[model samples]
Target: DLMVTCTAPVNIAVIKYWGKRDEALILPINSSLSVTLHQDQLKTTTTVAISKDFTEDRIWLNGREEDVGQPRLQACLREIRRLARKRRLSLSYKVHVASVNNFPASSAAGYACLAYTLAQVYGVEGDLSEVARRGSGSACRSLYGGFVEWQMGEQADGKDSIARQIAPEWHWPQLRILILVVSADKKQTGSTVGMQTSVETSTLLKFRAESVVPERMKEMTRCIQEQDFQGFAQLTMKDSNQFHATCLDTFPPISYLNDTSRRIIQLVHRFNTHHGQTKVAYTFDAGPNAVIFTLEDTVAEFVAAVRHSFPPAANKFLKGLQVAPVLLSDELKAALVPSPGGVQYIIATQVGPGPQVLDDTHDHLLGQDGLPQ
Candidate 1:
């Protein structure tokens, strides 16, 4: 028997990936860029074991058994096996997979974790981004650290549709991220269905994919390279807004942003205007939760303001980083709204590396019996 355990970090796209050109291939319509968040704050850990004694392949997620026959899941396993065969590898044994997310939900990170761990045990090396992409379009991006770009390759086979790192995690130490958890409930419209609808119904989606995103990708790349917060923040906010706009444009419109999300957006705009510059930027995925970006120097003041605006309902209101309370001037306080219990908690994190191997046997989620410990 052979086993391996790995963890992968979540990424918040500065230039969001909203739609796919080839659904089965998981190819994007537009190239998207993102910053990988530190795994200490949010991550998915997966363990895989392979042995000839096992009768069938099995899987578990967050302690509960999941179907191994899931198409995407099987897709990943099949691709890895094929790659292993290409290198004359693998034990040809039934496998057991156990995965858990540290931050309450999931992402392509789980798939990346599975792919990387499988590669370790199979002894198949080289780029596994394509295998991860088969599991989830964004999973490929999570395979690299720091800034990543998932190119929208022109090939129909998606041979060139791969993710590559623009900069290492250590490139910009001053940058920080805060995840404002407004609601942990699953999104009403799943990303897959939401993007599919947007592609078929929203004219704005097509325009953004063709006319807008091409330039934004170039400018966003430059901002990361130059470490220009102003341009970065502006483009980040605009791209998020545009992505949501496309959602709204979908016929029978999908509304991911609630009253709380809108309020947070207003708060960010007001906060930036008050400082006469863009001190922070907010971006939303296909959910109400807001991911804020700022520099290390501004985290304390901004976090204090957030607490003032949305008082926590419980004692564990903040996680990841500890920030000292800063007094907000009367004028600044007046500019911000007092909406108690609007946010559940805040996760303070910074840019970090991609998937990592946990060498210790104790780190394995699966026991010697090939079951979740």
Candidate 2:
């Protein structure tokens, strides 16, 4: 009768993971890195309990019971079990996992895999990376603190694939992140699908991944290690834009940055360039939202100015139609002035630590009755 609960935050890669080499294992083509944020801000809290009385494996997310039969989900559990068995740690208790996301799941925060890995690590003694990969390819990197890199292993079995910490969060504690959620609705194209398409069809992707990324990776590593915000910001922004460029170069074409996304990028660029100090840098995932990386000193003014420029609500008529008036609320609209019902909430965070266990009393999952109260 062992019950363990762990909470971990989602991390956005300042150095993005654009493509995957192994889809089932979630292995990436290139080595991508990121900074993990504090769990309270943007994270997933997971609780795992092992009991001999239980008969089957089950999972509940955000107070709702869900089937745990999916291959990806099962893969995480199987991998963890295999690792535990190898360690000679045998428990006959059926495992019950419960997870909850602080932010909207639609955000590119990587909650599902994050929660899965955290659960697998609970009551286990081995390295965290092995368990993290079972959840998601990128999950392994999220297990550590600041400046973590997921190595693109050469081994066919992905034996060498794992994440290593380049530097801890304290190494560059001044770095700040502002996540602008352009739209709460789930992305039309998941990162897995989108990256595969871009890799197969986009000629530019080949050039960027092979030529541009290598140079940027070197520079980014240096900037982070040396605490050079200017160099870090520049390289981050360029790499982000280049990633989007690759997406655009896809055969049928995919555009993640809408008008609002572009406007936010413009605002950040204008402020940083005007200040002449590389105060801020903006990046986007495979979605419409933006993640602005900057220093603590500049974040306040940058956020204030951007907020002022793009107020939450603005009266505007589209075309020659009096479509019902729409009130724009939420941080997303406050920062980007999205059309009514066009955007969702925004999250502001920065580099943080890996997952931690929580108590059953604080669990947000359903009880034996199978309903969350």
Candidate 3:
């Protein structure tokens, strides 16, 4: 019997991947960039065990059984087994897997953790992004830490459409991320279907892929390379807006942002206006949840402002890094409005490294019986 467990970080894209040119291969229409959040704050942990006595492969996610035969999950398993077979490794054993999330979830982060853990157990090596991508397109970006870019390659086979690390986690030490969780409920439109509709119907999606994204990719790369927060902040905000606009451009339309989401956007802009500078930036991803980016110096005040505006009724107002309370200035207070209980809570975090193996004996999600604990 052999068992291994690993955790993978969640990534929020600045330049998003909205449409897919080839859905079967999970190829994106445009290259995208994302910031990998620290695993200590938000991550998916997966445990995989292989044994000869088992009759069938099985999986459990967050203490509930999931279909191990799902196409994406099977795709990941097939890729790993194919690689293992190439090395003349054993493939007779059935695998048992259990995964858990520290925060919300990802079809990307979860699949990345599964693929990474499976590779480790099967003794397969060298860049697992392709394997991750087969499970979920954005999962490729989660394979690397800090700044990552998934280049939408020109090849038909998608051999070159892999994620590359632009910079390591320590490149920008002052950067921070605040995840404002407005609604934890499942979204009305699944990203896969919504993106397909957008690709087929939205003319704006075509223009974005053909013209808008290439230049933005270059400017975004430069912004990260130079550590220009103002430029990065503005670009991130605009990219997010354009992504949503393309959503609206879809036939019959799809709206992911709610009233609360709109209020958070206004609060961010007003706060920036009050300071006469770009103090923070917000980006939303196919849902109402807002991921805000700001510097280390401004986190406290911004957190305070968020608290003041969307007053939390629960004791668990914020998770992850602890922030000291600050008094909001009168001008800033006037600029922003109070909306009680708008946000569920916030997760204060920063950029972090990618997936890692847990050496601790008690860290495994599955027990000796090959079931979630």
**Candidate 1: deviation at residue 90, Å?**
3.6
lDDT of 2 by residue, 1-373 (tens): 5555566667767677787778777667677777777665777766666666668887887777889896767776777776666666234556777666766422223443444443454445645665567566677777776788878778878778888889987888777787766645445576667889988899888777677776777788999889998898888888888888988989777788887788788777767556666788888877787788877766556655554555444442111111233343354334442244343434566677766655556754545543344
lDDT of 3 at 112: 83
TM per candidate comes to 0.97, 0.84, 0.98
Candidate 3, residues 91-148, lDDT tens digits: the string is 9789999998977539889988988999999998888877899899999899999999
Model 2 segments more than 4 A misplaced? 89-92, 105-122, 183-186, 314-346, 359-373
Off by over 4 Å in 1: 89-91, 184-186
lDDT of each: 0.89, 0.67, 0.91
Task: For each of the candidates, give the backbone clash count.
Answer: 0, 7, 0
Query: lDDT tens string, model 1, 288-326?
Result: 999999999999889888888887776577789777768
How many backbone overlaps does candidate 3 show? Answer: 0
Between prediction 2 and prediction 3, which has the larger lDDT? 3
